[PDB]
Amino acid sequence: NSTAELEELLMQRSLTDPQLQAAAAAAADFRILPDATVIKIGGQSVIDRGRAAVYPLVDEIVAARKNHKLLIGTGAGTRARHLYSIAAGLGLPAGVLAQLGSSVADQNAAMLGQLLAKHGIPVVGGAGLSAVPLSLAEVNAVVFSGMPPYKLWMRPAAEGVIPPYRTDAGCFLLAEQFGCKQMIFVKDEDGLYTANPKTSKDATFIPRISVDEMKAKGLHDSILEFPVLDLLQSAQHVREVQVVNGLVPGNLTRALAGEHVGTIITAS
Amino acid sequence: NSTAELEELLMQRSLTDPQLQAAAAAAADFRILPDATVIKIGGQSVIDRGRAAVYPLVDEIVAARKNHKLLIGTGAGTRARHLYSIAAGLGLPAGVLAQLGSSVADQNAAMLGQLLAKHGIPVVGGAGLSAVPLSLAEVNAVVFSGMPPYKLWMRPAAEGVIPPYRTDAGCFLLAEQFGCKQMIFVKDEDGLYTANPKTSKDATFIPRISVDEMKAKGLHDSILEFPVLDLLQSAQHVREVQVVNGLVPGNLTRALAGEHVGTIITAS
Amino acid sequence: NSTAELEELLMQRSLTDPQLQAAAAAAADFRILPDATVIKIGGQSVIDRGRAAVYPLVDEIVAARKNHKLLIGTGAGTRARHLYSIAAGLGLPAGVLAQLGSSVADQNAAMLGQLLAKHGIPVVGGAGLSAVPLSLAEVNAVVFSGMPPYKLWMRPAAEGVIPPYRTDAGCFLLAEQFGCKQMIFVKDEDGLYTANPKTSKDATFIPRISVDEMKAKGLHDSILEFPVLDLLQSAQHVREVQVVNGLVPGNLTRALAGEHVGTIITAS
Amino acid sequence: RPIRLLPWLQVVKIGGRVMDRGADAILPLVEELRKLLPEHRLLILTGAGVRARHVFSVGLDLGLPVGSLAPLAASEAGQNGHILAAMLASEGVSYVEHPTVADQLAIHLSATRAVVGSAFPPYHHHEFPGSRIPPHRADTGAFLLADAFGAAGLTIVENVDGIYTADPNGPDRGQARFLPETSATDLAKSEGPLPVDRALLDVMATARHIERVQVVNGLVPGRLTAALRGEHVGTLIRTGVRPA
Amino acid sequence: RPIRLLPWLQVVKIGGRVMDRGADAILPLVEELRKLLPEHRLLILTGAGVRARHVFSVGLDLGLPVGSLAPLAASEAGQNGHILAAMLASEGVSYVEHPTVADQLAIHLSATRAVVGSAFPPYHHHEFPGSRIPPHRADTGAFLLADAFGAAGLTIVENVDGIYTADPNGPDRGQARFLPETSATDLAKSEGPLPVDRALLDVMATARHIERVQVVNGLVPGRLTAALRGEHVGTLIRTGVRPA
Amino acid sequence: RPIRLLPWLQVVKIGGRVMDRGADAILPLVEELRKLLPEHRLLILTGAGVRARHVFSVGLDLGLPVGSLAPLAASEAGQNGHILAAMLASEGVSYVEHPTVADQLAIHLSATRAVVGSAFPPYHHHEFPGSRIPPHRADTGAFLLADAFGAAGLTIVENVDGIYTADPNGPDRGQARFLPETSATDLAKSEGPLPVDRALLDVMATARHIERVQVVNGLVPGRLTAALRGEHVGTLIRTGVRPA
């Protein structure tokens, strides 16, 4: 490989050419925001529960940003499920549902940002490149809306019209793109179990598992949107994620301190 | 009252239902930016006067933000009066005038922000949630344009087409919505008098008065836009305002220090 | 002269009236960002060269903003030349080319901002009034896209359709408008020579020259866009500029320290 | 009185609780609107419905003030407007944003027969205080625009026949009597719930052009079409504007 | 020379000082424009007038540089454009923003017969230095667009008959003589005030398409209509473009 | 399956490498498009071509991840769209932005016969990881929109006759054989370069409406016109959608 070699392939071949694809893979790898942690705050699992779930998390974020740079993405929740139900019953395609679900993640970002404003933490568009707030000890965190930008260009799932890339995927891809050091999903269960702990009597807790092992055990579609497990296996930067229970006081703080609360899911 | 009770009324009744309205009134009350003071800098009364009025105020703002978090809203002034005269003579409705007056408050915000930029103070949209500048000792203040957002949806007055909610109302409502601790109107008279001191020989100064007392004395439409006195009586957070003379050196600084310069108008 | 005199001429004459033009010339002169230095990073000369040119400059900017407030504008480069070639061959006018060239300066600003984000330096629109980043020691610099705003309203050159005001002019005018203390163009030659040093065997280096002397020696169109030399002669605030070689390690740092590297071009 | 900016405009406000019924209500309404497109130049504005109740539940639980809740509810009205416009896209109809409605409606209705927008007005964090529930909602926003434009009419499409003396789905529905006609001043002086914002009655008292607004049942096909021709099929509300 | 992007376009610039006369000038102009809508595809651009003088008074008193004053004046031209468009809304006309004029004018004039925009060009904080008064104002912005588009014409609507040898409302009005025709190069070499920006003469010298611009009195009904048909009713300014 | 939002729409994607040929390719294409405007309601989407290769060269040299490179390439497709729209402006065509395409295409195609947009989809910094080259490019974005809208077709305009068994301009061009028809599943399982994004074959596998996409040579006048009438003049790609 060389720069000049790559530049010739880039000029002379289709981008689909395996020889150009392999030369580009040899490029250097820059991490844009390597010292940041991306956290997703679940819509259904946390924000829809109101003050009893959100106020302790707000206190944890305020304490945590003293030691940890944070990008805090919001989930969507029950209002997006309602929009999806109305739109799917009309026969609208996945790209139209995708646009409707963004509005609900935005509402949640606005509500969380208003609780955080007097602590100096803004809601932003462009979290990964919100250079100023992330460089200041007074701030050191931003809130963003967790849906991806795909809108009408959303790829549909193999079946049905629910957008397959929603706020788990939005937050994950932002962590991956900006080369962040850690990705934490804040949900309302202690972590991954062998069955849905809400629906199932003797599900066993799983502290640590690989994407291949999850698929083999029939957990591809359990505590995270299932396409995230495939994005994780393709990821250059974030090769594991941690799922934690935001309802347990201090859980987010402990995960940020390196404690193994919850479940660690690894690409390999 | 309870959350579940309120949630049932919210699902099952019209929002107009007195029983739902009363249950919602029992909700907790969060103040978004409780340590901020909103100041309105009058368009006609200050900014239209140029350097002799504006430069001492700029120095006061720069000194004051060392000790006091400030949201500084601009008035409109003579250019908006000119637009209103042209548009009203054409028969245009209040909603169209409202849009024209915003442009003039924006011009004033731009001119004031350019004098403040080298002091680190930005002009912003979204002052109440300008979390970053308000959290930094280097900044601790923002400038915003004081007209409300109502535009073509402006409620007209009972008579005529001049928009009744202009920059006094815009600034007041921002202070009320963000739960700010104090609202100061910076005008060009020492405060409220028993008649327009510009037009009237022996008007007597009024240091302190309630909205009901102002109405009873025929002052509903004197030194503030009159709808502000009704908004003040409905306000949850800002239940009094202070009117001061921005032409007197240090008056704004003294009001921010708790001195009773000017007139204090109280909701009750 | 007086304020009242000027105000009467402003009300009663055309803005073209020589008597109003002269009265306005007597106005006070406020410098909005007097302690800032504007730097242009050349598109063809630096950013198009990739990592070997850009990474040492990124390190210099990071070190330099400890002592110097910086507004860093990007050039455009080879992709804009390609757009100009396609559009000119179709017969499109200068105003349409101007719009196409902006996109390339934006791409360059995005690439440079992503390398700078983890150092707290943002890409901004409105650099001159980016009050907050410029007031913080943690930040003290911003990146902006160097094309002017003229778009379809671009004045054409006397001949041909290439926009005559491109990123040299954009950066220069921002320095002039904000009353910045210094303007540094970062190119890929040590400075101005008596002929194009790329094309010409025994060109002699010129450390210092006036715009009139450059025109007299046939250098009006050499290392800077030629209209910039006329803008410089009309400028109120920035009356000289320095051209330096960004390929030489530390050259930008030394120029910011007051060393006479490169060429100083003076209005008079 | 001010001139009428768009005297030929018809404004139709579709209740958020009608949209909440899903395809069973929306498909017949869409078919009726398709047939109305050649007959009228329509600005169609959607209300918010049940999702705004959920965001109020969360926001009030978090303690948020009324100016925080106003744009949160408005979002739900925007989303209903995008859903309705998508169903009408093949007839040339799209959703347009509030600044486009406020400044460019004339050109958009020259291009196509109808457009859809959110009925909430942009009061946002400058919503008036007093109640913890935003007062200037979809009926109110639709009327402010219809009257500012000097439109030929405003018709409100409800999930009930019109205004009754009590909520006809509520604890006192047994004595709910239907009102074929009423004045805004009469309604304003009564206490009790209505199917229209109480702020609508206030903006009616300062109106300059719209003389009557009809509330009709959008769950009965043909009522909207009849109301747009002036036929009395629901409750007429007299605003107390008089002819010049 | 470059192609003409919109060869069928007519551009009309309305002076801010005409709009400042209020209804007595604006109502007859609106009536004349209504009657012109079927005849021409019009981009109507408004200048700034007396409110920009007031903002210059304040801004110059505050010491602000010429790039600060350029968008402050442009605002006043935008506001005049919104006022004029509102009066024409019932005929399908709306105000459109500068990016819409620069990139989408073709589709907007396919939708409707005319649109209104601000005549100031977006030079903003990149206005050229030298004078403390922004040089690229409404006449200049209107000409840059008309010539970039390769429009069929630009007509400037003034509050006077055209260009005279002295200001016909000023201290030397007694010897002001009317000029039925002039060249931009001749004007450029004279000193003294004009009713058009001095920058307009500069942009005329580099023009590629527009051969003549007529300045006519918008306070006399029918002059705008005559000028749009090429009739000589004010001052013709030859730009010194020649036919291909 | 979901409804078709715009069943009467034809989508045409113009390759960035066709635009890179400049006037010699663009002028004949513009003339052909002008003649197609009365026949079809067209959304014309441009790809990126060689300038995106240069920005990838710089960006990959700087180490930037695939989400950084995706909007950098998309810019080049936007710029080609503005160039093509300017050439069609006199026929009423303009460039429209992605949010306008996603929410307001119905009204814009009611106003005029065609509009132009960027074929890249807005995946931006949320582009999928795995390759250092953004996978969801112009062919892919054009197909996602054509299929979401339930359009009557998508035609891809290339600088070659269609898909061959090897790159017909590359080191193995000697054994490149032309494929008049193929399925997306067959292509997806082969290795080697294509003139269409490999992501296009993936989005074809989940498609709900578009049954076939034809790739034709835009350097041969009349092929685009023939393809829009269903005539087989390049390579047909079957998506594996079946009729309801």
Ligand SMILES: Nc1ncnc2c1ncn2[C@@H]1O[C@H](COP(=O)(O)OP(=O)(O)OP(=O)(O)O)[C@@H](O)[C@H]1O
């Ligand atoms: N095997 C499993 N282990 C743990 N939880 C599971 C499992 N299978 C399903 N779940 C469910 O996943 C839920 C979390 O996903 P959900 O989509 O509710 O989260 P969220 O991030 O809050 O969503 P959003 O932000 O999209 O509203 C848990 O509430 C749990 O009921």
Ligand SMILES: Nc1ncnc2c1ncn2[C@@H]1O[C@H](COP(=O)(O)OP(=O)(O)OP(=O)(O)O)[C@@H](O)[C@H]1O
């Ligand atoms: N009873 C009164 N007491 C004091 N001032 C009064 C009274 N009645 C009228 N005024 C007038 O109110 C004026 C202040 O209101 P005005 O609308 O000028 O202020 P502003 O906030 O500068 O306006 P804007 O920002 O809208 O231009 C004072 O200049 C004074 O002349």
Ligand SMILES: Nc1ncnc2c1ncn2[C@@H]1O[C@H](COP(=O)(O)OP(=O)(O)OP(=O)(O)O)[C@@H](O)[C@H]1O
């Ligand atoms: N007399 C001269 N002295 C020095 N350099 C000259 C002279 N005449 C021409 N040049 C050329 O000017 C070039 C710098 O201008 P160029 O337009 O390449 O710079 P840039 O700022 O990188 O451009 P952009 O940002 O517009 O791509 C040098 O590379 C040099 O070849």
Ligand SMILES: Nc1ncnc2c1ncn2[C@@H]1O[C@H](COP(=O)(O)OP(=O)(O)OP(=O)(O)O)[C@@H](O)[C@H]1O
């Ligand atoms: N006096 C009344 N007459 C008729 N309906 C009433 C009355 N009081 C309350 N209601 C209730 O109002 C309901 C309509 O609800 P609402 O007005 O909130 O819906 P909407 O108008 O569809 O919503 P949005 O305001 O968000 O568009 C009716 O179904 C009825 O139950």
Ligand SMILES: Nc1ncnc2c1ncn2[C@@H]1O[C@H](COP(=O)(O)OP(=O)(O)OP(=O)(O)O)[C@@H](O)[C@H]1O
């Ligand atoms: N030589 C001249 N011939 C004609 N009018 C002149 C001349 N010199 C100055 N004037 C003045 O210019 C005035 C027109 O003013 P001006 O051109 O500023 O207005 P406008 O074009 O309406 O404003 P804007 O440029 O903001 O659109 C005339 O009424 C006349 O008094």
Ligand SMILES: Nc1ncnc2c1ncn2[C@@H]1O[C@H](COP(=O)(O)OP(=O)(O)OP(=O)(O)O)[C@@H](O)[C@H]1O
């Ligand atoms: N199997 C193949 N069949 C046909 N062309 C191929 C094949 N493999 C590679 N190519 C090459 O792809 C080239 C077309 O390039 P490409 O698809 O990148 O351009 P484009 O579609 O115009 O660009 P964009 O994707 O930016 O719109 C052809 O000219 C040919 O050289």
Ligand SMILES: [Mg+2]
């Ligand atoms: Mg998002």
Ligand SMILES: [Mg+2]
């Ligand atoms: Mg405001």
Ligand SMILES: [Mg+2]
């Ligand atoms: Mg720029």
Ligand SMILES: [Mg+2]
């Ligand atoms: Mg209702």
Ligand SMILES: [Mg+2]
């Ligand atoms: Mg003039």
Ligand SMILES: [Mg+2]
């Ligand atoms: Mg291709």
Ligand SMILES: [Mo]
């Ligand atoms: Mo639009």
Ligand SMILES: [Mo]
């Ligand atoms: Mo538009």
Ligand SMILES: [Mo]
């Ligand atoms: Mo548009």
